[PDB]
Amino acid sequence: GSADSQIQFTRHASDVLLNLNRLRSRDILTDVVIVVSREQFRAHKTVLMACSGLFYSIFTDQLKRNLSVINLDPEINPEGFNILLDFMYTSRLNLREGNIMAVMATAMYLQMEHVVDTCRKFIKAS
Amino acid sequence: GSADSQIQFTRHASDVLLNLNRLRSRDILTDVVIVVSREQFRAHKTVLMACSGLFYSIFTDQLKRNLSVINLDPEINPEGFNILLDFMYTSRLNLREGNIMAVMATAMYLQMEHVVDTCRKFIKAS
Ligand SMILES: Cc1ncccc1[C@H]1C[C@@H](c2cccc3nc(N)ccc23)Nc2c(F)cnn21
Ligand SMILES: Cc1ncccc1[C@H]1C[C@@H](c2cccc3nc(N)ccc23)Nc2c(F)cnn21
């Protein structure tokens, strides 16, 4: 007789993230700039919040919710922040011997606990 | 010697989407209301654009970019729109014998071509 069905699209989340990275490339509906000393990164707050305890805290603070510019701590590496923003929008964490420690430091500052734990493994591997 | 590594987080996209659905539940950084005759659905424009040709077109139109309210065609089923918004934020398409045709109609209105094609299969299955 009658048949209700819940259908799982396994590629859906990945497709969403590709499309979110494409909006970011074309600067579509980006609503915040992240300033890392001399560098700037345009992003969507919702993606930052979804990926970072720190951005979650900032944009859930009802004062800071509407900020269009966020200045990161002077100590934060721009190259490392860039790697972690790419990771947020692609699921791909790109590590070099040269940056791994800066990436891990930035991940911890950003409260990206799973990225930090993966950084720990790469360190031992090398 | 030196070892660069690009690491794939297979669960990352799914985790992002869970967190995006949680922001929507708690109405955090939602920036549009979709009015379907008598009903309203708060959402994030970036997720709509990522999932729907129609919302892609609307929010890329530089006039309509900043709209906080979108009125859908009077003919559109609210129950069907709700199913497709849940699908956008969860990857799960929930179909009943009663709504499948309305879901497919709404998917096509929204330019969600992969959802329409899956609706076609369910129709034959039942
Ligand atoms: C509070 C909560 N409960 C259940 C599920 C999810 C959440 C939080 C988690 C938060 C988030 C992400 C990634 C690393 C995080 N690390 C920390 N130390 C803190 C928050 C972190 N991001 C997010 C959203 F965009 C929506 N909800 N949440
Ligand atoms: C233009 C383009 N080229 C390559 C890759 C992606 C895109 C478009 C596709 C568009 C979108 C989604 C889902 C069904 C769509 N159906 C239609 N008929 C039209 C657009 C549809 N959504 C989206 C973003 F949020 C960012 N980019 N894009």
At how many Å resolution was this determined? 2.0
SS (H, E, C) B78-106: HHHHHHHHHHHHHCEEEECCCCHHHHHHH
Nearest CA to ligand 1 atom 18: A53
| Nearest atom of ligand 1 to the alpha carbon of B23 | 26
Among residues A41, A21, A22, the alpha carbon closest in space to that of A31 is found at A41
The three-state DSSP-derived secondary structure of chain B is CCCCEEEECCCHHHHHHHHHHHHHHCCCCCCEEEEECCEEEEECHHHHHHHCHHHHHHHHCCCHHHCCEEECCCCCCHHHHHHHHHHHHHCEEEECCCCHHHHHHHHHHCCCHHHHHHHHHHHHHC
CB-CB: which of A47, A60, A125 is closest to B16?
Answer: A47
Owning domain of residue B92: 1-126
Question: Tokens 């074309």 correspond to what residue?
Answer: A26
Q: How many whole angstroms from A20 Cα to the centroid of ligand 2?
A: 10
Pocket test for ligand 2, best of B56, B106, B110, B113 (most atoms within 8 A of CB): B56
Number of domains in chain B: 1
CA distance, residue B46 to nearest chain A CA (Å): 7
Experimental method used, please? Answer: X-ray
Cβ distance B94 to A6 less than 8 Å, yes or no, reads: yes
